[PDB]
Symmetry: D2
Subunit: 178 residues, 4 copies
């Protein structure tokens, strides 16, 4: 019935974070936000320089080793648990593995009421925003713009190519069941 | 002949910073960027809590005392000097005083070749972006969206309401004389 | 047997974060780090301007309403769950309620193997570091330097008044059971 | 007579920034702060990935090309100009070239009244702090701890190995002539 967790999926620079902050502002009840970024933040710095962790090549390519996977899995069960405990949770992620990534989340979520959101944005535009934002490693936006959505099922889809974050947030909130 | 300094004026959240980073990326020659933000950054923390400095009320209103003015004046002469010394300078500012602010800059710039840029964006949209970005004090975007341009003369005008930063950057670069 | 979660308690500017990063570097196994700061980060911005959330007065005093408490409780169960799922968790917090705060954590932790760490630092010194770091609201360091430890039981205690973060980290790691 | 500019030199993680913020707090008159960091910040992102700019190898080594040098030179004349215009300026830098770097600054400073400050800190300790702070590229602290001071003349020297930032700041302020 009541939406317990909102999960956004989109390529780097698709506007996920902005939409999330907008959602936190728009939604009447307090929603805690967590995403792959804050996850990286919580991992030890040395994790960005390892095997089973995460590394970014020159052109923005990204690869995830098993060490990273293990931690992420536990982190996933944690946020799910937060929701299970009564806290409304918003999660933004980048499904590098497309549908597989969704399945992974599905395994952790169980019968929890989740609102699956797709955040699209044209590759060239995303790339431009990537430059505007000043992201360290250029190239991610273009590389992730489309593949991350392949085979992924959404309850709602927003496209930031021509819609502001606040507007996308409004569309998403509309589907949130209190 | 050659453009020595580019000065952007626009309300908070109009997209100035993003355009600046885009300009730095687009322009072939290295352009140093400085703005009211980095200026605040360079001022002592206690300056945000003083008389002659800067304070933000509850609704996003902003006021500048003489202490702030004095420092800013010196900072202005400095960047102008940087340009005079051969470094290409990009400056983004918020002309709270409208035309008066432009005159102030004019006094410091002298006969230096400057490209005056106006960065517009609808108030409501700016406000939305202000929320998306997560700015501490909400209200600035709306309050500054229009007044900062009153009586201000520009060599080029861009409107981020429906144009990406990179696109605005392209428009601006086109007017930059090597 | 094996330590599953490390919980550090100390006043603002006692050096908790630095020690945590050192621990992440020193410890051979990957430890995920979370603390009151990242929690605030995950809460909606408007939570810093509410009743049941968190507010900071002029002199650095801090108060926590029920809205905040509710979220924090769920967040607590989450990290505990992360640990329960096999991820090594490091948590730094500020026990404003002294022993009561420890009891709260005890209720969530259950029989989970936890290493309780106390991070002390002289008030005047902490205050100085608070200034050095450039923290927005001055006054917290002094106000929290001692009360947060009243009635709190620790497995290990470190004092950063005359010990570097890395050194304190070494002391703490020594008590971590693989 | 009156001190117009304070220039601090020290290896990465020697505590320069903290001392600077302390100085801004301690000193009665408003002092603007600028340093190699804010300079990097003002340079285009692509400058960290070029020839004549700045690059950091794997072990924390740093090299500066001519492109970087040119900009820095202009930036130097700028801050000097700020001081010449009546603004009190604080500058923290890392003299990779030792005495040569001081000479460079001397050429730009001219007869301006400057207070030269040396900020020392043991290499091993600095390294530890580098880890505590979470600096991206480890290794700088150790590599720069001593060479940056070779042949460099100071009006005042502080050592953060066993002195807090605030204390070092007090020592430095004592030499500031109003």
């Amino acid at each position: 019935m009541t939406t317990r967790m909102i999960i956004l999926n989109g390529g780097s620079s698709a506007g996920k974070s902005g939409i999330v902050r907008c959602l936190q502002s728009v939604l009447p009840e307090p929603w805690l936000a967590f995403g792959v970024d804050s996850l990286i933040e919580a991992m030890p710095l040395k994790m960005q320089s390892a095997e089973g962790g995460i590394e970014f090549d020159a052109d923005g390519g990204v690869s995830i080793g098993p060490e990273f996977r293990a931690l992420e899995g536990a982190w996933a069960e944690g946020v799910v648990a937060m929701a299970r405990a009564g806290a409304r949770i918003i999660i933004d992620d980048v499904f590098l593995g497309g549908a597989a990534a969704q399945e992974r989340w599905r395994s952790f979520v169980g019968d929890l009421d989740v609102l699956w959101v797709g955040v699209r944005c044209d590759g060239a535009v995303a790339e431009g925003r990537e430059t505007a934002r000043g992201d360290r490693v250029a190239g991610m936006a273009a590389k992730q713009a489309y593949v991350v959505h392949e085979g992924v099922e959404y309850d709602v889809e927003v496209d930031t190519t021509h819609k502001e974050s606040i507007e996308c947030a409004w569309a998403i909130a509309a589907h949130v069941v209190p």
